[PDB]
Amino acid sequence: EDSERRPSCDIDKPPPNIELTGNGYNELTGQFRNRVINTKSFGGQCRK
Amino acid sequence: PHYILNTRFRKPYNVESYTPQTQGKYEFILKEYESYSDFERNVTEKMAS
Secondary structure (H helix, E strand, O other), rough: OOOOHHHHHOOOOOOOOOOHHHEOOOOOOOOEEOOOOOOOOOOOOOOO | OOOOOOOEEEOOOOOOOOOOOOOOOOOOOOOOOOOOOOOOOOOOOOOOO
16 A cells, blocks of 8 residues: 555556567467566566 | 557456557459450442343
8 A cells, every 4th residue: 555665666658569579489380479478577676 | 557559458367468460461453354346247249231
């Protein structure tokens, strides 16, 4: 409730579709796959 | 947080991933056909005695 230390330092927008890059890939079909690497996380280290 | 075209979206618990894709592929096929056929005949014959 009481979120101190300026959470997210007023950083609003992430990259547009980084989930597409983080998503899986297939070589024999040339079609992308489901997300594997969760890039939506931040680990606390805000990088503006 | 999930932003698509500067719009605040929220991923529900049932959807795994919903990513925008351009994927623009359009086709257009045009075909034409024309045929001309003409026939003309005029035979003249005259006999006198």
